[PDB]
Design a protein around this ligand. Sequence first.
Ligand SMILES: Cc1cc(-c2ccccc2Oc2ccccc2)c[nH]c1=O
Length: 109
Amino acid sequence: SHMEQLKCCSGILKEMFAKKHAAYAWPFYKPVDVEALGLHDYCDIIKHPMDMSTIKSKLEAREYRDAQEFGADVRLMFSNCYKYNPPDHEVVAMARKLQDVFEMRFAKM
Ligand SMILES: Cc1cc(-c2ccccc2Oc2ccccc2)c[nH]c1=O
């Protein structure tokens, strides 16, 4: 059921925002500040930005038909991080820790 699975998606996102994962999830909470120092080329490289607060808003506005569409936006958020940053960047390691949480929950739902 699409309704039941979207409720599960809201539960996954709630865990990603939880204190348990806060040490590595915090860079993903809000949209990337493209006006910040070092991010002058972000919009040239990242054509479709995504963050957890935007996904929470899309869930609330019924913008996902099913769990696969919610999953696509979570993976877009991580892929943007892996595309923009150098592979040894601190934020890439944080993205992998949070993607581990997401993938385990998304697979078992
Ligand atoms: C998804 C994402 C997020 C951020 C980012 C967002 C808010 C504040 C600081 C931030 O930078 C950090 C740099 C090192 C470690 C952690 C964060 C920067 N770059 C990205 O690609």
